[PDB]
Amino acid sequence: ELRDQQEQVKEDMETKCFICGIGNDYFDTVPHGFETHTLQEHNLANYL
Amino acid sequence: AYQQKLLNYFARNFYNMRMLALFVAFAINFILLFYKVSVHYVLEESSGYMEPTLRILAILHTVISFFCIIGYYCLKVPLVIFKREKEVARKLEFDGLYITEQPSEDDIKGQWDRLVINTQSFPNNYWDKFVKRKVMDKYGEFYGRDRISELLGSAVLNSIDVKYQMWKLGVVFTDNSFLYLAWYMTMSVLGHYNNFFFAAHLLDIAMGFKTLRTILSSVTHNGKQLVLTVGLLAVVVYLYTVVAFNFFRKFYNKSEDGDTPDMKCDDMLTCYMFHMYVGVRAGGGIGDEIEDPAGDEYEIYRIIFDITFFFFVIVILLAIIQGLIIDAFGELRDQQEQVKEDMETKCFICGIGNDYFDTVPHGFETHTLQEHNLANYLFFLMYLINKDETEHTGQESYVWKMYQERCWEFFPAGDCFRKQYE
Amino acid sequence: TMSVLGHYNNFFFAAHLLDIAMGFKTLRTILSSVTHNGKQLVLTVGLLAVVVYLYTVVAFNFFRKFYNKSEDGDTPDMKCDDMLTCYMFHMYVGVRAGGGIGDEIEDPAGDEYEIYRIIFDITFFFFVIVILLAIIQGLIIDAFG
Amino acid sequence: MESHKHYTQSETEFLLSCAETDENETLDYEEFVKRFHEPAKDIGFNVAVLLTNLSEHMPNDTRLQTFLELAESVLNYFQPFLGRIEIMGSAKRIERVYFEISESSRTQWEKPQVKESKRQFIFDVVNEGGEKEKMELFVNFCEDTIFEMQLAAQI
Ligand SMILES: [Zn+2]
Ligand SMILES: [Zn+2]
């Protein structure tokens, strides 16, 4: 159960965004785009 | 020239010869199993010369182990040196750490490579011979022309590079698999020195099979917590020793009935080694191998000490070891199934999905077998390396400029050919 | 033919108890937690044989004065200082003792090799009884999963 | 050539009258192949890259499909040799690229070994690979596999 928790976190950080909570097929009509979306558009540290 | 034809028999035939070394080690250790003390001596329920069969087979085994370190040096050493020269060239051309950043006293795996840039045969096994002038053109304008051009750079015996070749031997001797094969040959030689050494070549079922590796990989990837659990067992058994020394040391009589010259555990080290040698391996705790409480003053404190010994060592900690093994099996199988999911739900390169390529009847199989089909990118890269730079077409020279530039736009991001048109 | 040989001898007839395996449903869903995971189970037993062999190779060559099966040595003492008998001693006693081989052995009582003997015994206990039998049991449980 | 069922009989006379009639009734195998096959194969491959590129780029046309089923025995022979990838060719649409897969490169890729290195690589990428560094992992695998092939087809 401990390992299942530690893998559920990785799934919800590589399938949805954190803040806008969209999904992943939307930000990948751009070539290589969800990485830019969670590193420049929102990127949790910048709200901090 | 006959040396090279003899020498493409070692490298052609490395795997079968390595498996043959393992079978010969099986047969020699099987013959070794018929020893006897009398000095050591072998009997014979066999054919007439079964001590000279071992005298044959040990010589044949050392011949074959040397024969396969030759085969390894001529088969899988060019790939090690290709990966090392590849990384050194792609760290000069795009990071320039020997030109700009100067790697630290940490990472001797990189700081050793300072002795091959200065050499004069640096791109031997890398098919990219222009690394020298490419670094000179990238950095030789700001960081000085002559400095970079000076930093880069029996008669046949004095025509080879000595520094490059010493660098090559330095990289080879620091490799893992070659060091293992050298160990294997030296244990063959010490098996001629002493026939009992030859049994340590039974170690090669670990580093030589497939399903034996998929069983030992249920330990060896979960190993840090296994080591830490054994160490935690040592500390818990120590703290029980600290209790047992300081309130309980009149229950430890290994001797018969006390009339005998009685031994106790009222030193500290001997009580602790008593616990880790007897109390852990008894199965029933330590209240097995001890004098028992028979109506003493400390009977209840003794019972509580024993039962918490039994839980907190034998039930819980050995269950942590066994559950850690079983979870290692589970995590390994979960990886091997995640790979199958990401090869049957997305494409590899265009990374689309599966509901899009199945509006065509039976279409994702054609999409990952004809449209992209990972081998064809491999064959296309082999094509671009192989042609001359003048002979490229428009698309091949564009893609070739991208590949020498190392930027990787041109693989499809999310945009397969069917999606482009309509 | 085992029915006919059961007429030849009535004790043969017990081998028709083998048909609960190839004749039920939930008995097959329990034996299918072994019989599809069987190659690694066989290989784990074989690896146990090789590990116990290498322990025999140590125990023959430095330790063979601790093996007295006989009472007190005044008796006409048996040892394990052949190779096959020491190895069959290990795979018949040292694996099935539960507490390693430091159970069924003479113990170190302040000898020269006491510490080397203790290390030999405890690594016997881990690398056979904890780890390999846990590999068998974890392989069964993962077959269920 | 009559026993091997391949050739219509006027074309058997054509291949007879073609070759050499080398001084008794003889003809070379190799020096009739090399002079009626190297060039032939080359042109065939180039023409296949043309007809295929027309069919793949211009589908749903009766006339080209009629011409292609008119011309099938070259496209069948050159299917194990032509590979086609898709890239982004600087006009910011997506073009496809045709090229010439060799033979030793074709029978080298799967031998027992590289066929297993490929699934080792795929197991590495899905386990620990990312969004950004993925294709740069794939080209490091490509360059290593190509050097392994350049060895193992010269042994
Ligand atoms: Zn957001
Ligand atoms: Zn794709």
For residue C76 the two structure tokens come to: 């006409």
Resolution of this model in Å is 3.6
Calculate how far, in angstroms, residue B419's C-alpha sits from the geometric centre of ligand 2. Answer: 11
Beta-carbon separation of B412 and D86 below 8 A: yes
Which residues of chain D make contact with A32, given a CB cutoff of 8 A? 131-132
C-beta separation of D105 from D149 below 8 A:
yes
End-to-end CA distance of chain B: 61
For residue B145 the two structure tokens come to: 């022309």
Which residues of chain A make contact with B330, given a CB cutoff of 8 A? 3
Name B40's bridge partners.
B37
C-beta separation of C112 from B62 below 8 A:
no
Sequence-ordered list of residues with C-beta below 8 angstroms from that of B39, at least 6 positions apart, any chain: none
For residue B337 the two structure tokens come to: 């199934």
Residues in chain B: 422
The C-alpha atoms of residue B391 and residue B401 are separated, in whole angstroms, by 13
A&D contacts, CB < 8 Å: 6
Which letter does DSSP use for residue B40 in this model? B
Which-ligand-closest: CA of A42? 1
The C-alpha atoms of residue B2 and residue D45 are separated, in whole angstroms, by 39
Q: In what helix (H) or strand (E) does residue B399 lie, and over which residues does it extend?
A: helix B394-405
Calculate how far, in angstroms, residue C66's C-alpha sits from the geometric centre of ligand 2. Answer: 68
C-beta separation of C93 from C9 below 8 A:
no
Q: Which method resolved this structure? A: cryo-EM
Beta-carbon separation of C138 and B215 below 8 A: no
| Residue with tokens 């740069």, as numbered in its chain | D136
The C-alpha atoms of residue B84 and residue A39 are separated, in whole angstroms, by 33
Which-ligand-closest: CA of A43? 1
To the nearest whole Å, the CA of B243 is away from the closest chain C CA by 23
Sequence-ordered list of residues with C-beta below 8 angstroms from that of D49, at least 6 positions apart, any chain: D82, D98
B382-386 own/partner pairs: CB under 8 Å, 24+ apart: B382/D102, B382/D105, B382/D146, B382/D149, B383/D99, B383/D100, B383/D101, B385/B127, B385/D146
Tell me the helices (H) and strands (E) count for chain D, helix number first.
Answer: 7, 2
The C-alpha atoms of residue C48 and residue B7 are separated, in whole angstroms, by 39
C-beta separation of B282 from B237 below 8 A:
no
Chains touching B (at least 3 CB pairs under 8 A) are A, C, D
CA distances (Å), B151 to each of B143, B147, B341, B399, in order? Answer: 11, 6, 50, 32
> Any idea what the Cα angle at residue C17 is, between residues C16 and C18, rounded to 5°?
80
The C-alpha atoms of residue B17 and residue B33 are separated, in whole angstroms, by 24
Q: SS3 for D131? A: coil
Calculate how far, in angstroms, residue B409's C-alpha sits from the geometric centre of ligand 2. Answer: 13
Task: Say how far residue B233 (Cα) sits from the centre of its chain.
Answer: 28
Could you write out the DSSP letters of every residue in D80-142? TTEEEEEE--SSSS-EEEEEE--STTTTTTTSSSHHHHHHHHHHHHHHH--SSSHHHHHHHHH
Which letter does DSSP use for residue B293 in this model? P
CA distances (Å), D71 to each of D6, D15, D116, in order? Answer: 17, 21, 38
Burial B54-73 (b: 16+ CB within 10 A, else e): beebbebbbebbebbbbbbb
Q: Which ranges in chain C belong to alpha helices (H)?
A: 2-8, 26-31, 38-62, 84-89, 114-124, 131-144
Instruction: Pick the residue from chain B with its C-alpha nearest to C138.
Output: B326
Provide φ and ψ at B370, rounded to 5°: -130, -40
Q: Is the dihedral of CA B178, B184, B187, B191 positive or negative?
A: negative
For residue B134 the two structure tokens come to: 């490419």
> Any idea what the Cα angle at residue C27 is, between residues C11 and C48, rounded to 5°?
80
Burial D83-122 (b: 16+ CB within 10 A, else e): bbbbbbbeeeebbebbbbbeeebeebbeeeebeeebeebb
The C-alpha atoms of residue D41 and residue D34 are separated, in whole angstroms, by 10
Q: Is the dihedral of CA B203, B82, D109, B2 positive or negative?
A: negative
Q: Is the dihedral of CA C115, C119, C120, C121 positive or negative?
A: positive
For residue B255 the two structure tokens come to: 């001797």
The C-alpha atoms of residue D70 and residue D60 are separated, in whole angstroms, by 16
The C-alpha atoms of residue D85 and residue B100 are separated, in whole angstroms, by 38
Where would I find the beta strands (DSSP E) of B14-165? none
Q: SS3 for D82? A: strand
Calculate how far, in angstroms, residue B230's C-alpha sits from the geometric centre of ligand 2. Answer: 48
Among residues B82, D133, B216, which one has the least CA distance to residue D124?
Answer: D133
